[PDB]
Every structure is written in structure tokens, then in C-alpha cells.
Design an enzyme around this catalytic site. Structure first.
Site, mmCIF file in Angstrom:
data_model
loop_
_atom_site.group_PDB
_atom_site.id
_atom_site.type_symbol
_atom_site.label_atom_id
_atom_site.label_comp_id
_atom_site.label_asym_id
_atom_site.label_seq_id
_atom_site.Cartn_x
_atom_site.Cartn_y
_atom_site.Cartn_z
ATOM 1 N N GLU A 11 0.690 9.170 8.293
ATOM 2 C CA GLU A 11 0.351 10.414 8.976
ATOM 3 C C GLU A 11 1.178 10.582 10.246
ATOM 4 O O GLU A 11 1.773 11.634 10.474
ATOM 5 C CB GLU A 11 -1.145 10.480 9.313
ATOM 6 C CG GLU A 11 -2.054 10.658 8.108
ATOM 7 C CD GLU A 11 -2.780 9.386 7.734
ATOM 8 O OE1 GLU A 11 -3.950 9.483 7.308
ATOM 9 O OE2 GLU A 11 -2.182 8.296 7.859
ATOM 10 N N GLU A 61 -16.283 1.612 12.894
ATOM 11 C CA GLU A 61 -15.153 0.848 12.364
ATOM 12 C C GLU A 61 -15.248 -0.631 12.744
ATOM 13 O O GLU A 61 -14.766 -1.498 12.006
ATOM 14 C CB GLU A 61 -13.812 1.436 12.806
ATOM 15 C CG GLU A 61 -12.630 0.908 12.001
ATOM 16 C CD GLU A 61 -11.333 1.615 12.331
ATOM 17 O OE1 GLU A 61 -10.827 1.440 13.457
ATOM 18 O OE2 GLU A 61 -10.817 2.350 11.460
HETATM 19 O O1 LIG Z 1 -1.545 2.724 15.680
HETATM 20 P P1 LIG Z 1 -1.206 2.687 14.209
HETATM 21 O O2 LIG Z 1 -0.638 1.374 13.728
HETATM 22 O O3 LIG Z 1 -0.408 3.886 13.753
HETATM 23 O O4 LIG Z 1 -2.623 2.835 13.464
HETATM 24 C C1 LIG Z 1 -3.385 4.041 13.533
HETATM 25 C C2 LIG Z 1 -4.815 3.810 13.048
HETATM 26 O O5 LIG Z 1 -4.817 3.651 11.633
HETATM 27 C C3 LIG Z 1 -5.467 2.601 13.720
HETATM 28 O O6 LIG Z 1 -5.506 2.819 15.128
HETATM 29 C C4 LIG Z 1 -6.879 2.383 13.163
HETATM 30 O O7 LIG Z 1 -7.704 3.479 13.542
HETATM 31 C C5 LIG Z 1 -7.544 1.045 13.528
HETATM 32 O O8 LIG Z 1 -6.745 -0.052 13.093
HETATM 33 C C6 LIG Z 1 -7.860 0.924 15.019
HETATM 34 O O9 LIG Z 1 -8.688 -0.192 15.308
#
Ligand SMILES: O=P(O)(O)OC[C@@H](O)[C@@H](O)[C@H](O)[C@@H](O)CO
Ligand SMILES: O=P(O)(O)OC[C@@H](O)[C@@H](O)[C@H](O)[C@@H](O)CO
Lengths: 557, 557
Positions: free
Chosen positions: A217, A358
Site C-alpha cells: 500500500e 493488534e
Molecule cells: O511500517 P511498515 O513496515 O510499512 O508497516 C506498516 C504496517 O503494516 C505496520 O505498521 C503494522 O501496522 C504493524 O506491524 C505495526 O505494529
């Protein structure tokens, strides 16, 4: 069974609940003891405002609180806390430390991971953030046509989106002299499209926020932003003036094509949903200034120290956690409502939807055994007073028990009409928890119906509809003012509540393995949507939905 | 006991659930029967787009659906529906008709209340709205200094706020050529203050939306807006160019100082949470145009006719309602998640959080009996894909059963990057329900870990955390495009779902005595906040919180 259910303090608590919880009536608890508020509340003086955690309108006695505290101790909460703070690898499924507390460690006391103090690197990145904030906010950082930056756009999702969004919304009054801030997160093209429509490429700076720098995304949104930018700039070298990165992945940031000096680093021991305190908070610091960002960190640090130093029986996040355990594991309540009486806090509930759900929406314990008890609740809510008109009907007169946290600042950021609006807001805040506790007795409602001129027949029929059973428990969290410092303290408080609950359930609050399956299956479906060919590779529902998509996508309406 | 629990068809359903529900396994149901999607979905052709209601990923068989439909017949759903549509006073505690269906009755077939057709007055107000919209949108309507209107501000709360807010957000692409729209609702002074800061009194038109015209938040906000306006205009006659009212209370509208020609009337049989179809929708019509507002009404009318004329077994709102009963009263699920994969629909879940919970958060039946079963669920959600990164961890791997409705348009309003964003959005929409259904067996996870190169020790440690139990039921609701018409049909569908559930529970979906209580509550506390003296008039918590407010309100931060 599981660690919690095999614990004798838990068994004692559960047996007590079975035998005695029917004797617990909020009205009676207050009537029996005029010291109830005094004994079941914490008035915290942070030296930068007070936070009152009033947990007195809960279905608890002295004995219940004692049993709960004993359970926290016998589930290893004190030792687990110290392990987090010292850099132990308590995220055991990923073998990682859990050190959001290091990000805001204002004392700079050494915190070691693998024998190495993390504080120099924490502070180096903070210094980089401060320098960048000066350059951008002063107007010294110029866009490709030599103009000052007026708009900052954070592109990220989940942990790389919700924190900075919620905090910039909450701290809006502190943003004078700062650029406008925008948040793009959804892959839905509507999000970036409507954002870019209101922006000039000459004066917009994009912050690509991604721990991995691989999230589909975020990278897709980032690439769309870059394409839009390059259409106007027509020069690949200009990207460095308009795109920066917040990441742990130096290599993937380079592949995208961002300047290495434009990268603000964080670490694997910073969970995304605990990341606003890191480089991820850059949009916060840009919007409200680095000084205010430091105040936000300092408030969190205060609460970290409160959590670390305070005996469990008067430890705010511990007590909030314990009340939650009582309602979840003894009463069986699925949900927890967060109801801030503050428009600026309109994304606070959504933030902790992620923070809580989460973290603790888990079912496997440290031993690998499945839980045989409930874990994390469904978190939800909207700001007061609006909820009073919208879903409080169900809280008051439905068939669900719903623990609610009511939150409000004593001082408003906008004391219009000589404080009239805030007076009314405060009055509603107080009256609602009072009403939830007290309800309305048949004798009270009957007199009201009588005075309204209702016939004996009409009165008889209407009466039960006008009666409120009450006995609906709430927490009231009241604080001097919603300043950067106080907001930081409040967020940290709930972070530690979530931590304590996770330890007690014997789950890992800090991984998120549940995201994997949906991601795998989406990768498989994506290429199947292209073209006219029938898709038969899935179950009949998935196939049928795809068939509908292919049939309906060309129809002109 | 209550009507539902005394019902033999319900007891049969519940007994069947007890004996057989553990044997319902979605993965296996789909494998055994390639016709499952075909047998458990409705593809509705509205002639203005299709709506596919795919309920095949639910924990149901043909026999379960048969029992549910039989229960609906036994509970007299059809007769109750006909009574609503005919103008019978089915809101029995208020002795009112329930006629949101009349508001959008495009056929103009007479609907009588007290012997008199309501359609002439419905259409008279619609004509007034149409005329007013033309005058404002064309630029013909001038403010007190002779300038065209650029901003419209709806002031209202609950039913007088959330509908128009959600709909203007959802239909944003249709707002070109319309004035900017603002929504002020909270009494919290931040709401009006930050709105007014962005406006000029010369070019702003305020819409005071209030059924009663006595709601404290709304009248206070309205008075604040009027004071701000008059500070600039300094002429009471100028109010008529800048303030209109949407109400049932002509006397109170007059008392506030609004011209009768500036009042858009509705009626007592329009519930607030069912009111966007009435004069309350004026801000919708102003923003997107009256033609699009008419299309919205027409879509609802289509769905009304579907509900009215379709056999129960093929009736979309009925089936959605029955599935909900199955999960609420047999499985005991507290909540229902609404997950639209559409950024424009970002307030859709919040809207039905009100619509559902305020309607069916009830515990007294038509007979005066207290329910001995669950009624309305807690409704919650956020748009996809963001939820996948916020709270889907809990949906996939928590300890709660959570029925989810996944919604998406096939066609996006913004097909940027040759449809790339929407392709990914659709892939995630499809994958998530597939994942929730299928899960991932220990043996499947084991093979994945083996392929990844994990050692026997590391594999065994990680394995249980990687397992997805699945069997998590969803609805998928897919529609050609989110046009005004289709949105109208979707909202009406959920309105009727809520109606059917209410009838089956024997409750009044159309009163709100808990919301009515809320409006009686804060008045006592209000005057007590003034002055420095201690308040002892309440329970010690209320007293203590008031003491904290008084002690903290003067502190400088
Ligand atoms: O920051 P990234 O690697 O793009 O990930 C973006 C999100 O998927 C990521 O923040 C997810 O919400 C969890 O792992 C946070 O604990
Ligand atoms: O429109 P009014 O009278 O100002 O009332 C505003 C709100 O209290 C009211 O909409 C409330 O949400 C419910 O009764 C709607 O079904």
C-alpha cells in the site's frame, strides 16, 4: 490448560466472582463507604498538570482489588516490566527487544541491546529530526522551483500512519508556524487522488513512512506521488527535495530512489503500533515543532517512570489493566469503549483499536499452548457528547456489559463564550457516568410519568421503558489540559495497560503473525483480476465474487 | 419470559445449534458443494447497477436458513413490515407512525397517517429544497454584503448530523459546483471555534438541523454562530440571508429568530436516525445537487420495494437480519463489524453504529416483558484496507467471534494508475474473507516453515503462532459503483435489516428513552461547576471529579 487459568490467584478471583459478583451494586458500594472515591482513584501530579484516574465507579471492592493485584504479581508483571525496560528480548516469537520506552528515555540512562547502549543512536536521529524541522519550518528548505514548503504528506499505513495522524489531530492548537499536514494510507486510489488534488508539487513534501519499506500500500502510494510529482518537475534529481523516508530498511529506501541523508532511521525493537515516538513522529515534529515533540516524549517518559517505580496497588496502567482482566475474564465482556469528551481526540479510540487489538488479539501463549480463556477486547468509541445521541442508548438500555473509559481535559483549548461550551461539556461528562451507575428507579420514573399527565393505563405501559437498571461501570480519566506532555503521558499509560494485560494472559503483545494469511492470499488474487478469463482457482464464493467484478466493471451507469 | 424465547421455532433453532453447530466447517462446506455460492447469494439487478449480497461464507446450511425463515414468519415479520409501510403507529411507546419510507416514496402512492395522506407535504418540502438548492448553488442567493454563498454549515447532533455527514463524505465526487460543506455537532467549543475560524460571515450559510429545536448542543452551537454572525453583520434582518432551519417545531424556530420561509419541515414519524431522507438532508442536496439527492431517495425506494414485495427466503434485508439473529442469539456474538473497502465510505460504519445500536439497544418488549435474551449488537468498523493493519489481527487470531460485512464498489471513482490501486483494493477485499473462512492448518503452516529453512527447534517454537483456525464467517456485499442511487439502496437495506431484527426481538426499534434520559442529565451539574465551593450533593466520585475540575481549571500550562 493455560498459564492464567492454572494460576491459583486467578482461580480464587474466578471463584469469588461466581459466588459474590451478584452482591456487587455500584449504588450500594458508594452508600456504604464515603471514602470510596478517595480509596479508588489516583491523582497523579506530573509537575506539568495532573491526571486523575478515577476507577471508583467500577464493580470492585477492596477485596477484589487485592485479589487482582495479587494476580498481577503471581503472573510475573513486575519482572516482565523490568525485562522490557532493560532491553530483554521479550518479543519472543521474533527474538526482539521491545524498546519504545528507549525512544522517549529523556534521562538518557543507558539501555543496552546486545550489550550496546541504544541511547546515542536514539538521540542522533532525534537531532536529525530537529535539524530537518528547522530547515522545513523556517522556509529554508526549498522546493524544486525555490519556494518554501507549505504542505507535508505522510504516506504510510497502520503503525506508520495512525500515531502521527491521531497526535497531529490532538495537538492542532500547537501547530502555528507549521506546515499543513496530510495523511495518505489507504491503497484505495481515492485517498491519494483527493489529497494530491489540493496540492502543488512546488510546495509539497512527502514523507514515506515504512519500517520495512516494502508494504504494498505504502510503496504503491509513494510511487503514485512520485509520478504526480515528476509530471510537473520533469527532473529525477528534484525528487530529493520533495521526498524523505522513515525506515529501518536502508537498502529498500535507496532502491526507491531517496537520498541517504533524507532517511530517518528507527529500529527493529520499535513496533509499528508503538512507533510515533521514533522517526515515525517526524510529521508530528514538523507540524507542532520539535520543542512540542520533546514535550510529548517527556510526558511518555513521566508515565514510564510512574509505571516502573510505583507499587502495583497504586500504579495507574496496572490498575486499568486489572480492571480490564476482571471484566474480560470474569464478567466475559467482549468490548471496551474509549469515549474522549474532546473533538481534538477524535482519532484516539481508533489509535488504540490498533494499539490494543493488534497487540492482544492473540490466542497462543509463551509455552505454545492455546489459551483456554479470553484475551484482548474489541476497542471502539466516538467522542462525547455525540455518542450520547447515537449509541449510548445501547450502553444504558441494552443487553451488553460495556466497560467505558470517559476522558476529558479540565481546560479547553477554545474557551469561547466565557467557557459556556466547556461547562456544558464537563457537565455531560460527569452526568453520564453518574447516570450509568445510578440508573433510574421505578419510583422516580413513575412520578415523572404522573407529572407529564399520563393516564393510569399509559403510565402502566410506559413505566418499564423509562426505567434504567444502572450498575454500568466506568472509569473517568480527567487531566488538567491536553498539552503535548499530557497527551504523551496518556498514550504511554494505555501502552502499559496493554503490556500488563498481555503478560497476565501469557501472550506476546509485540508480534502480529495474524497479518500473514490475508497478505498471502491477496498476492495470489491480484494477477487473476486482470483480463477477461474466468477464475476458478478458489472456493465458489471467492470465484463468484471475482466473476461479478469482471462482469460489472465495464457497465456504464 | 419474552416473545422470542417463548417461540417454538426459536427453541428448535437453538436446540439445533446446540446439537449441530460444532459440525459446521466452512472450508469443508465449500469443498463438498460446488453450488454453495449460487445457493447462498443474491444478485440484485436494480436497473441502475447490481448489488451482490454473498452470504455463502456464513456458518449456515440449507436447513439453518429454512429454520431462520420459518422463525421470521412465526414472529410476524411480513405483517409488521406492512404495518410500517401503511402508516400504522408501530412506534408504540411514543404513539407515532414510522415513515422514513414515505420520505422516499417516489411512486407517490398515498400513505395515510390519521386518515390523511402524507405525500403532498413530503413533496411540498422536497420542492422547497429543490428551489433553495438552485438559488444557492447558482450563486443567485446573496449574503448580507451581496456576495454568493461559498460555505454551508450544518449545525446538529446525532440523527441531525451523522446522516448528512456520512452521505456528503460518501458522495464527495458528486459535489463539483456545490458549496463547501461543514458539520458542527459537538458542544465541545473546539468544534464550532475551528469551523468559524475558517469562514467569513459574508459567505457562510448556517443550517440549524434539529427535530425538536431544543437540543442543548445544537441550540448552543446555533446561538454561538448567530452571535459571531451578528458581531459582523450588526443587523437582525441579515440573519434571514444566512440561517435556515430543519425542524418539526415552527414555534421554537420562530423564537430563535428564523424566518418561517427559511424553515424546511419534517414530521414526528421521521426518526432522527432515519432522517437524512427528509429536510434533514438539505446539506446533502446543497452539496451534491438536488438531482443527486433525488437519486439517493430513488435508490432507497428501490430497496423499500424489494423489502416489501420479495419472498423472505430471497429478501436481502431479511436474510441479513436472520444471519445476525443466528450469530447474536445462538452463537452469542456481542458485535458486528462493518468494513467498507472505500475511503469515501469512511463514516458508513459510524452511521450504522448509531442506526443499529440506538434502534435495537433495548431490553423491554411490546408485552412489557424484560428480554431474557440478547438484543442489538455493538456495531463498529473502519474502511479497508487500513483495518488489516489496525485490528484484523484480533479478527484472525483473537478469542472473539465477530460477524463481518465486507463492502466494496466494483468501479472506483478514481481509476488512477490505469486501475492499479483499485485492483489491489479488490484483491485485499477478496483475500480477507477467503482467509477468514479458510484459515491455515498446523500441517499447512509446518510445510511453510520447513520450506523457509527453519530448524526443528525454531519450527516447533513458531508453529502454533502461525496457525489460523479460520471458520470465521463474513458477508460480502459488492455493488457496481457507489453512485447516489446505489448508496441509497445500501442504506435502506441496513435500515430494514435493523427493522426485521427489532420485530423478531419484539422490541421497539423506533424510540430512544436512553437518549431521552441523556438530555435530562447534565442540567443538575451545570450550575454546580460555577464558583469555588465544594460540591457534596452527589456520590463521592461525581463530587471528587467536580473537586478536581475546580482545583485544576486555573493552572497555567
Ligand atoms: O511500517 P511498515 O513496515 O510499512 O508497516 C506498516 C504496517 O503494516 C505496520 O505498521 C503494522 O501496522 C504493524 O506491524 C505495526 O505494529
Ligand atoms: O434533532 P434533535 O431534536 O436536535 O435531536 C438530536 C439528537 O438528539 C437525535 O437526533 C437523536 O440522535 C435521536 O433521537 C435520533 O434518532
Amino acid at each position: 490448560m493455560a498459564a492464567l487459568t492454572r494460576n491459583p490467584q486467578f482461580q480464587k478471583l474466578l471463584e469469588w466472582h461466581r459466588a459474590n459478583s451478584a452482591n456487587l451494586k455500584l449504588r450500594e458500594l458508594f452508600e456504604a463507604d464515603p471514602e470510596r472515591f478517595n480509596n479508588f482513584s489516583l491523582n497523579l501530579n506530573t509537575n506539568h498538570g495532573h491526571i486523575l484516574v478515577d476507577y471508583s465507579k467500577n464493580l470492585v471492592s477492596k477485596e477484589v482489588m487485592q485479589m487482582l493485584v495479587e494476580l498481577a504479581k503471581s503472573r510475573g508483571v513486575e519482572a516482565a516490566r523490568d525485562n522490557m525496560f532493560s532491553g530483554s528480548k521479550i518479543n519472543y516469537t521474533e527474538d526482539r527487544a521491545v524498546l519504545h520506552v528507549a525512544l522517549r528515555n529523556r534521562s538518557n540512562t543507558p539501555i543496552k541491546v546486545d550489550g550496546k547502549d541504544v541511547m546515542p543512536e536514539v538521540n542522533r536521529v532525534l537531532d536529525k529530526m530537529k535539524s530537518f524541522c528547522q530547515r522545513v519550518r523556517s522556509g529554508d528548505w526549498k522546493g524544486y522551483t525555490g519556494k518554501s514548503i507549505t504542505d507535508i504528506i505522510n504516506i504510510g499505513i497502520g503503525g506508520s500512519d495512525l500515531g502521527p495522524l491521531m497526535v497531529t489531530e490532538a495537538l492542532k492548537p500547537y501547530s502555528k508556524g507549521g506546515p499543513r499536514v496530510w495523511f495518505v494510507s489507504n491503497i484505495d486510489g481515492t485517498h491519494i487522488a483527493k489529497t494530491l488534488a489540493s496540492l502543488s508539487p512546488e510546495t509539497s513534501l512527502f514523507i514515506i513512512a515504512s519500517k520495512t519499506f516494502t508494504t504494498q500500500e505504502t510503496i504503491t502510494n509513494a510511487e503514485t506521488a512520485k509520478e504526480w510529482f515528476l509530471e510537473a518537475a520533469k527532473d529525477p534529481s528534484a525528487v530529493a527535495k520533495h521526498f524523505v523516508a522513515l525506515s529501518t530498511n536502508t537498502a529498500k529506501v535507496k532502491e526507491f530512489g531517496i537520498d541517504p541523508q533524507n532517511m530517518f532511521e528507527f529500529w527493529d525493537w520499535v513496533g509499528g503500533r508503538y512507533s510515533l515516538w521514533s522517526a515515525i513522529g517526524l510529521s508530528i515534529a514538523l507540524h507542532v515543532g520539535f520543542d512540542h515533540f520533546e514535550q510529548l516524549l517527556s510526558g511518555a517518559h513521566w508515565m514510564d517512570q510512574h509505571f516502573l517505580k510505583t507499587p502495583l496497588e497504586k500504579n495507574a496502567p496496572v490498575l486499568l489493566a486489572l480492571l480490564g482482566i476482571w471484566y474480560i475474564n470474569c464478567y466475559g465482556c467482549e468490548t471496551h469503549a474509549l469515549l474522549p469528551y474532546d473533538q481534538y481526540m477524535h482519532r484516539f479510540a481508533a489509535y488504540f483499536q490498533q494499539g490494543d487489538m493488534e497487540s492482544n488479539g492473540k490466542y497462543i501463549t509463551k509455552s505454545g499452548a492455546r489459551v483456554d480463556h479470553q484475551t484482548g477486547p474489541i476497542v471502539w468509541g466516538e467522542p462525547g457528547t455525540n455518542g450520547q445521541h447515537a449509541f449510548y442508548q445501547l450502553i444504558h438500555q441494552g443487553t451488553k456489559m460495556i466497560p467505558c473509559d470517559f476522558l476529558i481535559p479540565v481546560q479547553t483549548q477554545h474557551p469561547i463564550r466565557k467557557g459556556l461550551h466547556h461547562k456544558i461539556l464537563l457537565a455531560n461528562f460527569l452526568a453520564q457516568t453518574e447516570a450509568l451507575m445510578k440508573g433510574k428507579l421505578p419510583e422516580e420514573a413513575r412520578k415523572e410519568l404522573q407529572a407529564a399527565g399520563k393516564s393510569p393505563e399509559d403510565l402502566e405501559k410506559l413505566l418499564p421503558h423509562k426505567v434504567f437498571e444502572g450498575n454500568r461501570p466506568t472509569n473517568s480519566i480527567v487531566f488538567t489540559k491536553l498539552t503535548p506532555f499530557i497527551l504523551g503521558a496518556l498514550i504511554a499509560m494505555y501502552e502499559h495497560k496493554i503490556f500488563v494485560q498481555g503478560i497476565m494472559w501469557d501472550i506476546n503483545s509485540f508480534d502480529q503473525w495474524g497479518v500473514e494469511l490475508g497478505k498471502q492470499l491477496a498476492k495470489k488474487i491480484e494477477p487473476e483480476l486482470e483480463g477477461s478469463s474466468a477464475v476458478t482457482s478458489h472456493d465458489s464464493s471467492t470465484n463468484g465474487l471475482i466473476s461479478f467484478i469482471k462482469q460489472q466493471r465495464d457497465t456504464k451507469l
